[PDB]
Design a protein around this nucleic acid. Structure first.
Ligand SMILES: [Zn+2]
Ligand SMILES: [Zn+2]
Lengths: 160, 126, 180, 87, 138, 86
RNA sequence: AAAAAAAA
RNA sequence: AUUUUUUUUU
């Protein structure tokens, strides 16, 4: 018998429902996640897949799959795909790769304006995309404290 | 705030001592690093004014080198002068680009500036 | 292959259909061009039970076999355009197979007022698959290609083709405005 | 092999060379024509820079838990300037 | 750098430590009957089986091949080759020789590392290494 | 997670690392030798207990959670000079 | 009751 | 014959 092996992170119903509601809200009601995709449970022939969120990053994409009938059941999986090449991706790296393309971050000339006290327009409200970088960011975040409906983060959905 | 006024002239002797392979203490190096950072930070007109100043300095040094080597018009004298001046360019291309690291951050380039100045003054002429 | 009457009836792009109320069913006319030099391969599929035309086409192209390293240009003229399930299965198939340049041409839009169908069409466009409305050039191409003209027929195709092209302006504008 | 960064107040912070090589400013400053002196960075900020050197060189390899660096906001702005000098 | 990446990055250090793996499933059913279901599920590959790693939500899921389209994996033979975090690995362990619990860890997949395509791998490497911060022009 | 330590001899503020239950002699064998000082004529201190002379890793066995790289714990050697303030 | 057009 | 609304005409 042939098999395909893949990592599923078991999650409960409340967290999966919250993630789906948030991604749906920011796809349509809001404007941050218009470029994403969504594959409902009736658009896929896989008997266990309940949902699929596609996040196009450049010429590649990130697929977050939510499953139906597992044990101890459902779960979430994360994959990075580029033209039939696929890798498993952990939640933290998934968030970091998401923040590279989509949600607003500090501009190039953001450290200087803060140094002199000048106002900085483009902030970084997607903190979940930053998991150690540089001391400049840490000091900047300690200086300026940076959404009522929380943005879609893969690490909060895939908690526990 | 304090950019290029009473500041570039402060490091000008240090810049010309860094050029021509003149001995410079480490404390002067650290002071020049701090001054370059302050100039590039406080008013941000560094990658332009520092750029022009370094370009004119390297061009003036190249012209002085041409003046000092035209007195050695002999072919053997020209060759030995070129050899020692190539040692000088090696040392300067090694040492000079390091202090102006913030030039890249804002926008080294002084190394390629010296490279093209030497190409125009020497390689293009001879 | 198709028929002149079958072509003019089943490939209509109008929103009226006159007093007679024959049903319009989704059809797929696919054509293969390899760069090696092989002749174009022609075929047509219907919405057989469960196996939507697109899905049947995918199964046909998978089963008949082709080389992986040779780029092939596939063009499918769909009567009704692909639905969301087909828009996703086709996207997955075209991502799996690198050497297939897929061009979808729709004579009319399938439930274009529903959000999931619009999102499926945007998905198809974004994932390297250009889906465009039929115009006069492709209408004429699939006319003289997938129809035998030996048998006599009424209604000069010249008029037929111009009628279809004229009908295919409002839906062209609708597709051009549907991508966002 | 341990470098000895001297602050503007004379406070000498001795740190491992590979820890102080994190910032490109130090890496470029040391090599050329040991011990590094500073004219602006005070002790209470060079100390935090060295602490961050150790913290990053320890936790960069880790991929599961990353404890937050405790930065006092009332000094963070000034700290930022020092970081802008180094990184 | 794929070969070296296994030995230092903490994710693989915590994953490859001979972790205890417990099958999750029909625990409500009687233990003898439940191990019977596990045995007959491993007999014919027409079901899914999940191992919960005994303490974390991470689970290894085995699905039949013909569930996501047609497009080696065994079942003491629990070899599971995959591409994790960009590097080819094999999750290997034993749970089927015992009743319903056992051991499992990771090993390097040198053959899959060499056989894997290069352009996409370096594309992912560049994507992972780079940081969004202070990258947008201003 | 090995303990991370800083030694404050007046102005000098050495930074280093040590094992969770490493002995004091291992702390001041070569690590202190960077200051060009042998173990002789040297004795470690810790807060108020003064650590006596050494070799007693029990009292010197600071817990890993009590001394993080983010906030390493001071040691002292001999008075100390407090850090300046803005 | 019929024909034509636009939008969703 | 994929539905709703709007406009014009008989
Ligand atoms: Zn950000
Ligand atoms: Zn369909």
């Amino acid at each position: 018998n042939r098999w395909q092996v893949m990592i599923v992170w078991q999650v409960d119903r409340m967290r999966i429902n919250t993630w789906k509601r948030l991604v749906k809200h920011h796809m349509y009601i809001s404007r941050k996640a218009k470029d994403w995709f969504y594959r409902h449970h009736y658009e896929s022939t896989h008997p266990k897949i309940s949902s699929e969120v596609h996040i196009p990053l450049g010429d590649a994409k990130l697929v977050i799959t939510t499953y139906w009938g597992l044990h101890t059941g459902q779960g979430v999986s994360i994959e990075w795909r580029k033209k039939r090449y696929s890798t498993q991706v952990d939640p933290d790296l998934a968030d970091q790769l998401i923040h590279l393309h989509y949600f607003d971050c500090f501009s190039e000339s953001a450290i200087r304006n803060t140094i002199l006290g000048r106002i900085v327009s483009p902030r970084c409200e997607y903190q979940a995309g930053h998991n150690v970088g540089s001391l400049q960011y840490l000091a900047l975040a300690a200086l300026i404290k940076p959404i009522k409906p929380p943005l879609p983060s893969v690490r909060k959905l895939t908690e526990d | 705030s304090l950019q290029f006024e009473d500041k570039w002239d402060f490091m000008r002797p240090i810049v010309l001592k860094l050029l021509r392979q003149e001995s410079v203490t480490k404390q002067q190096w650290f002071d020049l690093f701090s001054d370059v950072h302050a100039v590039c930070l406080w008013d941000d007109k560094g990658p332009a004014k520092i750029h022009q100043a370094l370009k004119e300095d390297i061009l003036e040094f190249i012209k002085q080198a041409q003046a000092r080597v035209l007195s050695h018009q002999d072919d053997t004298a020209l060759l030995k002068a070129y050899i020692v001046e190539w040692r000088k360019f090696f040392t300067q291309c090694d040492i000079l680009p390091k202090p102006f690291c913030q030039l890249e951050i804002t926008l080294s380039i002084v190394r390629k500036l010296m490279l093209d100045t030497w190409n125009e003054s020497i390689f293009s002429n001879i | 292959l198709l028929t002149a009457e079958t072509f003019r009836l089943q490939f209509n792009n109008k929103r009226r259909l006159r007093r007679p109320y024959y049903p319009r069913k989704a059809l797929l006319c696919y054509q293969l061009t390899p760069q090696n030099g092989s002749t174009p391969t022609r075929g047509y599929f219907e919405n057989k039970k469960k196996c939507h035309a697109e899905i049947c086409f995918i199964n046909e192209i998978k089963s008949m076999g082709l080389d992986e390293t040779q780029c092939y240009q596939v063009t499918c003229y769909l009567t009704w355009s692909p639905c969301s399930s087909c828009a996703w299965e086709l996207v997955d198939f075209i991502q799996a197979h690198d050497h297939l340049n897929l061009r979808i041409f729709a004579s009319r839009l399938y439930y274009h007022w529903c959000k999931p169908q619009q999102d499926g069409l945007r998905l198809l466009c974004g994932s390297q698959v250009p889906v465009e409305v039929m115009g006069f050039p492709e209408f004429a191409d699939c006319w003289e290609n997938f129809v035998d003209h030996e048998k006599p027929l009424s209604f000069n195709p010249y008029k037929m083709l111009e009628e279809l092209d004229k009908n295919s302006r409002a839906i062209k504008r609708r597709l051009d405005r549907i991508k966002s | 092999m341990y470098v000895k960064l001297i602050s503007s107040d004379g406070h000498e912070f001795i740190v491992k060379r590979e820890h102080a090589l994190t910032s490109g400013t130090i890496k470029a400053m040391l090599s050329g024509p040991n011990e590094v002196n500073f004219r602006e960075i005070p002790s209470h900020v060079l100390s935090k820079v060295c602490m961050y050197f150790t913290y990053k060189v320890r936790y960069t390899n880790s991929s599961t838990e990353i404890p937050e660096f405790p930065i006092a906001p009332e000094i963070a702005l000034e700290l930022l300037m020092a970081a802008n000098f180094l990184d | 750098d794929q070969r070296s990446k296994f030995e230092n990055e903490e994710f693989f250090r915590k994953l490859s430590r001979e972790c205890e793996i417990k099958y999750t499933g029909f625990r409500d059913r009687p233990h003898e009957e439940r191990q019977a279901r596990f045995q007959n599920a491993c007999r014919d590959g027409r079901s899914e089986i999940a191992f919960v790693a005994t303490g974390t939500n991470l689970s290894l899921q085995f699905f039949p091949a013909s569930w996501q389209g047609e497009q080696y994996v065994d079942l003491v033979y629990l070899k599971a080759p995959m591409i994790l975090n960009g590097v080819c690995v094999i999750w290997k362990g034993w749970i089927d020789l015992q009743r319903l619990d056992g051991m499992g860890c990771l090993e390097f997949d040198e053959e899959r590392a060499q056989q894997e395509d290069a352009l996409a791998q370096q594309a992912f490497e560049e994507a992972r290494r780079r940081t969004r911060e202070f990258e947008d022009r201003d | 997670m090995d303990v991370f330590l800083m030694i404050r001899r007046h102005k000098t503020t050495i930074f280093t690392d040590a094992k969770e239950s490493s002995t004091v002699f291992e702390l001041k064998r070569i690590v202190e030798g960077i200051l060009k000082r042998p173990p002789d004529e040297q004795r470690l201190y810790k807060d108020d207990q003064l650590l006596d002379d050494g070799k007693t890793l029990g009292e010197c066995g600071f817990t890993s959670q009590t001394a993080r790289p983010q906030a390493p714990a001071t040691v002292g050697l001999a008075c100390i000079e407090p850090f300046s303030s803005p």
